[PDB]
C-alpha cells in the first residue's frame, strides 16, 4: 500500500463528521479504518498531531496512535521508543487546552507505550518530575496517571505474566509519589471541582489496582477531604459521583480486612458519618446524591458482611450498617431501594448457610423490617386506573421486588408471612392499593407456601373468590393470578373447583382481566387434571367461542392446550366425540376456505385454523394399549381430506405449506400406533407436492418421519422410497447457478434427513443407489458459507463416517462396516481433500471443530488409510508454506489421542492461508 497524501486524509476526516451524504461516512469510516490498520498510520497520526489544526484531525490522529501502540508496538524498532515517547509528550502538552476527548486518547497512548516500554523504568517519577509544578500540566498528568492503572490488565496490550507483575510491583513502589502529587493538586486549585474530580478519579484508579499501602492512606488527610466533599450539600453531581466511586474503590481494596484494619476503621467510621448528609439530601430531593449514598452504604455492607454476621454489633460488624440500608429501602423513589437488593440476597444466602439460631434470631428482625418496606414499595398509586402492567418501568420493578421478597420470606417461613399478609387484608379498613399489593406478595410466595398448612390457604382461597365484581380492576386482576397460583390447593380441596372455575369464567368475560383468567384456567386444567372430567364441556364452550373473549395469543393457545390435555385424560369411550367437537370449529373454517375459490387467498389465510388444530393434535395424547381402539384415529381420518386439500390449494405458498406440514405432523403423531394407516398417504402427498414445489419443510418433515418411524422395519422401505423420490427434485434445484448459496435451507434439511437415516436405519441408506449422490453433494456443500447448512452437512459427514468405527465387536456391525468401507473406498480421499481445502480457503474458523470431528472419525475408522489420504491432500494443495510445515501438520494430526488436538492443529495450519 502506498502512503496517502495528507490532504486526502484531511478530506476523509472531514467526510467522517461533515459529509451531508451519510453514506459518505460509510466510505470515510471504512477508508480511515484501512489507514489505521496500515503501516502509514504512525507517520500520518504524528504529522496530524504536529499540525494541531483542528479537533477532528487531532482526535482521529490520537485515537490512531492509541490503536497502533496497543496493537502494533511490535512493528516499531526498539530504537524508536523514546522518540515516540517524547513525540507523544510533545503532542499532549501542545493539545492540553484543545479538547479533553483528545487528551484522553493521548493519555492512553502514553500509558500503553509506558507499560510496553521497559527501558523507561521508573516512568511514574519521571512524569511527576517533568510536570508536577506547572498547574496547567496537572489536568493531563492526572489523566495519564488515572488511565495507567486501568490499562495494566488490558488484553489489548501483549504483556506476559512476568512483565505485568514487574509493572505492578513498580507501580506499587511509586504509588506514594502519586498520592503526594494528588495532595499537591489540592494545595494548588483544591477549590475547583474539576481538579477534585480528577484527583478522586486518580486516587480511585490506584485503589482499584491494589497497590496503595492502606496504612499510609490511613495517615492521609486526602481521605478526610474525600469524606468532607461527600458531606457538603453544595457539590456537583459529577464531583459527588467521583468521590462516591472513590470511596467505593477504597472499600473494594480492603476485603482482607484484618491485614488493612487501620484504614478499614476510617472508611467504616467515615461512611457512617454520611447519614446526616444522606437525610439532608432526601429532605431537599437531591436524588443524585441519595443514590450515590445508597451505593456507598451498600458497598460498606458488602465489604463487612462477614464481620456483620460473625460478630453482630461488634466492631466493624456494627448493625448501623443494616439500619442505614433500612433507611434507604424506605425512600419513595424505587430506584433507591433496588441498589441495596443484591446485598440483601447475599446476606440472606449467608444466613441460609450458617444455621446458627442466635445469628438467625438477630437478623430475622432486620429481614422482616425490610420485608415490610419492600411490601410498601409494591403499592400502586391510589389514582391508578387499570390492571397492573408487566413490561413496564414499575411492572418490571415489582417483579424484582417480588423475587427478593420470595427469596427472603423463605428465611422467615413462607406460611408465617402468608398468614400475616392475609391478616393485613382482614384487619383494619385496608384501601384497594394495599389490598392488591398484599395479594401480589401473596401470589408470589403462594406456590412456596406449604399445602400441609391447609386451613389458612383454604380461608384465603375461599374469601378471594367471594369478593365482588365492584372491586377495583387491579385487585380482581391480582386475585385471579393468586387463584391460578393456588391451583395446587384446589386440587387438594376439590369442593373449590366449581367456585374457582366460576370466579375465573367471570374474569375471562372481561377484556382486561380475560388473559389473566385464561392463564389461571390453564393452570387449573393442568394441575387439577384428574378432577376436570366434569368440567370439559365448559372448556369446550370456551373453545367454541374462543375469538369472542378478546384474548392475547398466548392466552388462547394456553386455553386450547389445557382443553386437549384434559381431553387426553377422559375415558377412551368419550374421546372421539369430544375431540371432534373440539376440532370441528376449526375444520368448518377450513372447509369454508376450500369452497371460497373466487379470490387470491390473502386475508382468508388458513393459518390460524391449522395452528389451532396443530395444538389440539399435539396435546391429545391418550394412553391407549394396542388392544384398545385408538380414539383419535377415527377423527384424524375424517379431518385428513380437509388438510390434504388445504395443502394442495396452497401448494405454491412456502409459509402456508409449512403450517400444513406442521399440522399433518401432529395429526399423525396424535394417532399413536395407528400411524400405519397414515404414513403412506402423507409420504405420497409430500413427494407429489415437493416434486412441483421444493419447499425444504417437506425434507424436514421427512426427517421427522425417519426419526420417529425409521426404527420400524415395515417403514424403512417406504421412507427410503421417499428419500430417493425427494432427492431427484432436490438435486435438480441445487445444480442451478448458485444453488447451494440460494437454497441453504434445502441443504440443511436434506442432510438433516440423511442423518436421521444414518441414526435409525443406516444399512437401509448404505445399500441404496442414493448414498453416493448424497455424499457427493455433502462434499460440494462443505464449501457453502452458511452456519446452519454447514452444521447440518458436517453432522451428516461425521455420523455417516462414524458408522464404520464398530468398537464393540459383539454388535451386528459387519455389514455396516463393509458398506461404509465401499462408500469410503470411492469418496474418502475426495472428502479429506475438500475438508482440508475448505478450512484453508473457503470458510471461516467456525467450521474447524466440525471438520476436526469428521477427520477424527475417519482416523477412528481406519488410521493408516487416513494417513495416506491427508498426505495426498497436502501434496494436492496448490511460497507461503514449506514441505516441512505440511509434514509437521500431518504428524501433529495423525498422532492425536483426542479430537480437540486435531482442532488446534488444523487451526494453526489454517492461519497459513
Amino acid at each position: 500500500g502506498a502512503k496517502p497524501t495528507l490532504q486526502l486524509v484531511y478530506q476523509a476526516v472531514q467526510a467522517l463528521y461533515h459529509d451531508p451524504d451519510p453514506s459518505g461516512k460509510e466510505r470515510a469510516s471504512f477508508w480511515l479504518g484501512e489507514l489505521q490498520r496500515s503501516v502509514h498510520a504512525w507517520e500520518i497520526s504524528d504529522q496530524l498531531l504536529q499540525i494541531r489544526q483542528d479537533v477532528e484531525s487531532c482526535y482521529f490522529a490520537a485515537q490512531t496512535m492509541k490503536m497502533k501502540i496497543q496493537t502494533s508496538f511490535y512493528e516499531l524498532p526498539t530504537d524508536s521508543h523514546a522518540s515516540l515517547r517524547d513525540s507523544l509528550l510533545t503532542h499532549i502538552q501542545n493539545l492540553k487546552d484543545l479538547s479533553p476527548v483528545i487528551v484522553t486518547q493521548l493519555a492512553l497512548a502514553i500509558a500503553d507505550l509506558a507499560l510496553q516500554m521497559p527501558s523507561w523504568k521508573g516512568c511514574v517519577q519521571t512524569l511527576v518530575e517533568k510536570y508536577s509544578n506547572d498547574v496547567t500540566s496537572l489536568p493531563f498528568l492526572l489523566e495519564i496517571l488515572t488511565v495507567l492503572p486501568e490499562e495494566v490488565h488490558s488484553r489489548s496490550l501483549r504483556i506476559g505474566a512476568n512483565r505485568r507483575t514487574e509493572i505492578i510491583e513498580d507501580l506499587a513502589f511509586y504509588s506514594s509519589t502519586v498520592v503526594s502529587l494528588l495532595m499537591t493538586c489540592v494545595e494548588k486549585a483544591g477549590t475547583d471541582e474539576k481538579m477534585l474530580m480528577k484527583v478522586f478519579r486518580c486516587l480511585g484508579s490506584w485503589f482499584n489496582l491494589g497497590v496503595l499501602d492502606s496504612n499510609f492512606m490511613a495517615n492521609n488527610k486526602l481521605l478526610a477531604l474525600l469524606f468532607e466533599v461527600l458531606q457538603q450539600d453544595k457539590t456537583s453531581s459529577n464531583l459527588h459521583e467521583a468521590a462516591s466511586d472513590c470511596v467505593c474503590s477504597a472499600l473494594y481494596a480492603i476485603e482482607n480486612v484484618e491485614t488493612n484494619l487501620p484504614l478499614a476503621m476510617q472508611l467504616f467510621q467515615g461512611v457512617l458519618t454520611l447519614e446526616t448528609a444522606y437525610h439532608m439530601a432526601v429532605a431537599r430531593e437531591d436524588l443524585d446524591k441519595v443514590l450515590n449514598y445508597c451505593r456507598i452504604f451498600t458497598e460498606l455492607c458488602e465489604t463487612f458482611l462477614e464481620k456483620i454476621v460473625c460478630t453482630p454489633g461488634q466492631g466493624l460488624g456494627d448493625l448501623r450498617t443494616l439500619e442505614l440500608l433500612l433507611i434507604c429501602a424506605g425512600h419513595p423513589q424505587y430506584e433507591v431501594v433496588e441498589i441495596s437488593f443484591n446485598f440483601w440476597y447475599r446476606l440472606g444466602e449467608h444466613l441460609y448457610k450458617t444455621n446458627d439460631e442466635v445469628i438467625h434470631g438477630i437478623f430475622k428482625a432486620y429481614i422482616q423490617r425490610l420485608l415490610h418496606a419492600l411490601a410498601r414499595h409494591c403499592q400502586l398509586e391510589p389514582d391508578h386506573e387499570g390492571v397492573p402492567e408487566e413490561t413496564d418501568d414499575f411492572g418490571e420493578f415489582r417483579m424484582r421486588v417480588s423475587d427478593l421478597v420470595k427469596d427472603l420470606i423463605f428465611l422467615i417461613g413462607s406460611m408465617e408471612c402468608f398468614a400475616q399478609l392475609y391478616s393485613t387484608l382482614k384487619e383494619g379498613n385496608p384501601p384497594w392499593e394495599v389490598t392488591e399489593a398484599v395479594l401480589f406478595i401473596m401470589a408470589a410466595i403462594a406456590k412456596s407456601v406449604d399445602p400441609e398448612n391447609n386451613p389458612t390457604l383454604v380461608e384465603v382461597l375461599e374469601g378471594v373468590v367471594r369478593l365482588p365484581e365492584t372491586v377495583h380492576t387491579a385487585v380482581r386482576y391480582t386475585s385471579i393470578e393468586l387463584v391460578g397460583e393456588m391451583s395446587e390447593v384446589v386440587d387438594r380441596n376439590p369442593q373449590f373447583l366449581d367456585p374457582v372455575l366460576g370466579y375465573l369464567m367471570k374474569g375471562l368475560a372481561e377484556k382486561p382481566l380475560a388473559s389473566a383468567a385464561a392463564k389461571a384456567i390453564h393452570n387449573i386444567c393442568s394441575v387439577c387434571r384428574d378432577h376436570m372430567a366434569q368440567h370439559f364441556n365448559g372448556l369446550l364452550e370456551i373453545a367454541r367461542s374462543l375469538d369472542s373473549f378478546l384474548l392475547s395469543p398466548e392466552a388462547a393457545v394456553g386455553l386450547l392446550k389445557g382443553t386437549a390435555l384434559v381431553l387426553a385424560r377422559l375415558p377412551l369411550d368419550k374421546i372421539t366425540e369430544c375431540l371432534s367437537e373440539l376440532c370441528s370449529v376449526q375444520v368448518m373454517a377450513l372447509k369454508k376456505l376450500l369452497s371460497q375459490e373466487p379470490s387470491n387467498g390473502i386475508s382468508s389465510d388458513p393459518t390460524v385454523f391449522l395452528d389451532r388444530l396443530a395444538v389440539i393434535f399435539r396435546h391429545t395424547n391418550p394412553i391407549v394399549e394396542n388392544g384398545q381402539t385408538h380414539p383419535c384415529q377415527k377423527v384424524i381420518q375424517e379431518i385428513w381430506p380437509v388438510l390434504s386439500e388445504t395443502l394442495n390449494k396452497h401448494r405454491a405458498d412456502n409459509r402456508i405449506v409449512e403450517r400444513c406440514c406442521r399440522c399433518l405432523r401432529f395429526a399423525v403423531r396424535c394417532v399413536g400406533k395407528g400411524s400405519a394407516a397414515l404414513l403412506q398417504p402423507l409420504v405420497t402427498q409430500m413427494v407429489n407436492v415437493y416434486h412441483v414445489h421444493q419447499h425444504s419443510c417437506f425434507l424436514y418433515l421427512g426427517s421427522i418421519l425417519v426419526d420417529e418411524y425409521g426404527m420400524e422395519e415395515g417403514c424403512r422401505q417406504g421412507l427410503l422410497d421417499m428419500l430417493q423420490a425427494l432427492c431427484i427434485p432436490t438435486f435438480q434445484l441445487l445444480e442451478q447457478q448458485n444453488g447451494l448459496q440460494n437454497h441453504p435451507d434445502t441443504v440443511d434439511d436434506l442432510f438433516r434427513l440423511a442423518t436421521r437415516f444414518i441414526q435409525r436405519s443406516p444399512v437401509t441408506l448404505l445399500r441404496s443407489q442414493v448414498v453416493i449422490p448424497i455424499l457427493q453433494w455433502a462434499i460440494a456443500s462443505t464449501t457453502l458459507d452458511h452456519r446452519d447448512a454447514n452444521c447440518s452437512v458436517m453432522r451428516f459427514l461425521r455420523d455417516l463416517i462414524h458408522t464404520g468405527v464398530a468398537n464393540d465387536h459383539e454388535e451386528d456391525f459387519e455389514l455396516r462396516k463393509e458398506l461404509i468401507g465401499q462408500v469410503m473406498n470411492q469418496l474418502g480421499q475426495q472428502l479429506v481433500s475438500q475438508l482440508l481445502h475448505t478450512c484453508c480457503f473457503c470458510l471461516p474458523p467456525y467450521t474447524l471443530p466440525d471438520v476436526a470431528e469428521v477427520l477424527w472419525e475417519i482416523m477412528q475408522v481406519d488410521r493408516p488409510t487416513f494417513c495416506r489420504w491427508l498426505e495426498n491432500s497436502l501434496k494436492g494443495l496448490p511460497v507461503t508454506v514449506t514441505h516441512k510445515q505440511l509434514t509437521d501438520f500431518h504428524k501433529q494430526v495423525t498422532s492425536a489421542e483426542e479430537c480437540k488436538q486435531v482442532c488446534w492443529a488444523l487451526r494453526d495450519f489454517t492461519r497459513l492461508f
Binding site: 405432523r665 401432529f666 424436514y700 426427517s703 421427522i704 426419526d707 438433516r752 436421521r756
Partner: peptide, 14 residues
C-alpha cells in the same frame, strides 16, 4: 433457531 423448533422434534431434544 427456526421454524423447526416448533415441532417437538429431535431438533429440540436434550
Amino acid at each position: 433457531g427456526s421454524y423447526r423448533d416448533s415441532y417437538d422434534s429431535y431438533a429440540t431434544h436434550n
